[PDB]
Structure formats: C-alpha cells, structure tokens
Amino acid sequence: SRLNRESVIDAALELLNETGIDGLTTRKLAQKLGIEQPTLYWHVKNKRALLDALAVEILARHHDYSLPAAGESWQSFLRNNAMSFRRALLRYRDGAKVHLGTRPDEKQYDTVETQLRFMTENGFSLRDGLYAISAVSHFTLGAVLEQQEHTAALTDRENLPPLLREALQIMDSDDGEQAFLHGLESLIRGFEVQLTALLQIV
Template sequence: MNDSTPPRLSRESVVRAALELLDEVGIDALSTRRLAERLGVQSPTLYWHFRNKAELLAAMAEAVMQERRQQPLPAPGQSWQSWFIANAHGFRHALLGRRDGARLHAGTRPQGALFDDVEAKLGVLCAAGFEPVQAIGLLLAVSRFVVGWVLEEQAGPADDLAAGNGPDAARHPLGANGWQELAKESPDAIFDRQLRLFVAGAEGMIGQRTG
C-alpha cells in the first residue's frame, strides 16, 4: 500500500458510488469488492477512507439523511406539532428514496453534523414544554417507528393493502371493514394518521414531570 491517499478518491466520492451501487444491487449484494471494481481500484484502497464495511454503511446512512436534510427548526408561526409531523414525513421519504434505505439506517446512531440537528430539535420540544428526557424519548420513539414502517414498506408488495388482500368479511367483519377503508387511502395518508397518534400522546406529557 502506498504512503499517501490515492488522489482521485475522496471519502465523499466513495460514499456517492456506494449509494449508487446500493440502488442497483441492494444491501445484501453490496460489498467492498464490488464497490472497488466500480471505482476502478483495489479493495484495500477503500480502507484509506473506511476501516471496514460497517463504517462505510454508517457513512452512507448519514449521507442519506444529509441528502434530504430535515427542517431543524419550525418556520415562523409554525406549531411544534406540524413541524414534528413534517420532520417525520421527511425522514420517511429520505429512507424510501434509497433501495433498502430503512435497512441501511437501522442500528445507526447520529454522528457528525447530525448531532447539531438533534440538539436543535430537542430545543424546539423543550421550548414547547417537554423535559429533555421526554423530548429525546419522543425523537427516539418516532425514529424507530419510521424505520420500522419503512422496513415493512420496502419489504412487502406495493399493493399489500389492496382490497382483495384483506380478511374475509364473513369471518372477520371488523378487520375487513377497516382494511377496505385503508385500501382507499394513499400510503402517505395512512402513515400520516398513525404518526399523529404520537403527537396526540406527546401532548399529554407536557407539564408532567418525570422521575
């Protein structure tokens, strides 16, 4: 291995190529060997920038969030509730924007500039009346909800709520009724309704001291 970093590669160019490869082959087929082939280098060259595949995947997940960076602060006059909902929608669409985006993100933690965004969001929630532990718990809960939701979206068929896929109305009338109503709505609308359950529950925590 040479004593200097190959000049034609940068950390950013490696991540960009890795995301393009992810969209083409999916996370299971993504390997440093295939990435090196795409970049026209030997696999050890990548270790100038990333010590292992796990570190590369973490950088890719961070890049996905930066691509569609969520609104860290409410717009003038915007309520914390509408800002919170908009952020969650933005997070979901960022994950949906990449093949296996939810699997890529699962298990990662904020790093780098993303900690600044987290701190700004916590500031908004604390200004609305939440204690820090409540605010960070709420962000954690909705983050895991969104990742889990998108995991299901990306793993299952696009028409999994089609009317013909639901329960039998004779045996399960309540389930069939609910299923048929959901089948009339868009995936965005269904997600939005469930997301608002978080807001409704969170509103009840304001003013309640923990511990």
Template sequence: MVSRIDRKLVADAALRLLNEVGLEGLTLRRIAKELNVQAPALYWHFKNKQELLDEMATEMLRRMTAPLSEPEPGGRRPDETWQDALSDACRTLRRGLLGYRDGGKVFSGTRMTDESYAMPLDALLRLLTKAGFSAYQAARAWWTAYNFTVGVVIEEQSVYPEPGDPAERRPESRDPAYDLASRSQRLGEEYPLAVSAGDEMFGDLERSFEEGLRIIVAGVAATTGR
C-alpha cells in the same frame, strides 16, 4: 481512472450502487469496481462493510437535513408548532429514506460518523423544550417518532422495493407478494379481520403513515400534558 479516493467519494458511490443492487448486492469489491480501484484501496477508509454503512447513513442524513440550514422556506418557520415540527421531521426522514433502495435497513442500527446530526436534532429538541417539554420528554418524543418512521419505511420498502418519491409510485412496482386480492382469497371468510388488517397495513401506505403519525403525536401530547 480514479487516482485518489476519500470517504465521501466511496459513500457517494455506494449510495448510487445501492439503488441498483440493493443492500444484499452491495459489496466493497463492487464499489471498488465502480470507482475503478482495487478493493484493498477501500480498506484504508473502511475496515468492513458496517463502517461503510455507518458512513452511508451519515451522508443520507446530511442530505436530508441540509434544508434546515438554509433560509426560508427550507428552514424552520418562526410560528411552527411542536406538532408541526415533529411531524415534518418524520416526513422528511421517511421521504429521504425512501429515496434509496433498502434505505430503511441501511439507516437503522447504524452509528453516525460525525456530528452533523447534532444541529438538526438540537433544533428540534429546542423547539420542543420551548413548548414546555422537559429535556427527557423532548428526547423521548423524538425517539418514539423516529423509530415509528424507520420501522414504517422498512415495511414500506418491502411492498415497493424501487426507490423514489412515494407520490410517483407506479402500480407495477408493487411486489406481487403483497397483492391484497390474492391475500384476501387465500384467507377467505375464515379470517375476515386479518383480511381487513392487511388492507389497512399494505393498502394506501401514504394514508397509513399519516394516520400512524397522528397517533404518535396525539400520544406525545396526551402523555406530556402538552
């Protein structure tokens, strides 16, 4: 019997349940049942589901960025280039969000509930400005790469709803709605470019992400003269 709960305890329980029921199935009532308390007890900490989602997203970010405050090899390398730093930040974000069912949807559009985001953000922006970016260019570079990554994750989790490491995905976990062979058969010879586009967008998602990330980094370099 849980006699006392706090915001972190509720967020931890919500993230566990998220992997079981997804975003649509996640309710304050269900979380209260998981914690063995009455639902009104949660309203002392969260007025509504959106406030809970904000806290969940904040806890997700804390977990993703924890290695940055650790000694090598978890922290930043002294010889790290801005291209490496920006790319690695996006990879960390993607892997972290893919670890939760509907992680991309939970994370997008939410607000951080504390300042834990400031340290990793400041460290990345500091590295970019040290490489010659203006403060504006550094912020714009990260904001563009960040939105690309979150958008990719949301689409990726439609294809593979099960949470986990993308390197360990099982073929049977792919949503049948994204079967490329049946899609190709439906479109036939009338729309060959749409067929090939589908293969590119929903085929090898790891390669698709990495190539898109290279385009983003190259675009940042081209527009900033770096």
C-alpha cells in the same frame, strides 16, 4: 474513479440502490469504482464505516426539514420532520436499514441539539422530549422498513378470511403513506395529552 469521501459515498449509494444492503460488499464496491480491493481498503475499512457514512449522507441529501420554522409549534415540527425523514429513508433501496442503530454524527450535533432544545422550550422535560422524538423516529423507521422489505419480498417469492382480505387490499392501496400519516397524527396527539396533563392523572 475519484475516491474522495464524496465520490466513494456516491458510489456506495448507487450500489445500495442497485443491489440493496446485501449487495453492498466491499468487493462489489471496488468493482463499481474501477479499483482493486486494497485500494478501496485505504479509503474504507469495513462495511460498518461505509454504512455509518451513508446514513449521514442520505439525510444531508434528502432530509430537508430538520429544524423548526420560526414560531413553529412542536406538533407541526414533529409532523414536518417525520414526513421529511420518511421521504429521505425511502429515496434509496434499504435506506432505513442503513440508518438503523446509528447515533448522531458530529456533523449532525448542532441540528439534533436544536431539536432537543426546541422540545424543552415547548414544555417537555429533556427525557419526555427525547421519548417523543424517539417514538416518531422509531415509528417512521418501522413503517419504511416494512414497506421497503415488502417490495423486496414480492420480487423473490387461497383461503383469506374477510377482514384480513380487506386489510391486505387497504395496505396495498398505496405506498404506506396513508397509514403512516394516520399513525403519525395519533402519536403526536398522544404526546400532547401527556404534556398538557402535567401532574394530573391521565
């Protein structure tokens, strides 16, 4: 097959979706691509390189709300950005796992700079703006992680107390979206309390 950047990543995304993060071995990638391993090594040195590139491409493909609308409130931007990030992370098997620990790629610099600048323009110190964005990112990654990994575990592997029993029905009543959106509102409002408080005790 074609071994340009785009096609290697396509194939790796396919292989990820088919077999998860453990299936992504340079060995199985060579098979999908129809090549020998030294051929693949010329293009792709190791799993880390591959994963870093997949993380960027997952957002290029499916992260459709990466910048604020004109005059958009910071609350609304974080909300829309979070839902977009969640969507993108859920579109491939183990995609959140792929994203973990990545730092912004050079291709993403202008976008992440604008996000950070936008927060400071709305009254946050750089630090407080970053802690908000971070918290949103972290909560969204955890929520997605937990969902994706739960589904995996249900393909592999009775005296419940009553509240737990009900709580289990509730979590499993949708894909996680209800709990995620409730949490996201809580988070955004907590940032707001913090921001508006200025130097007052809060």
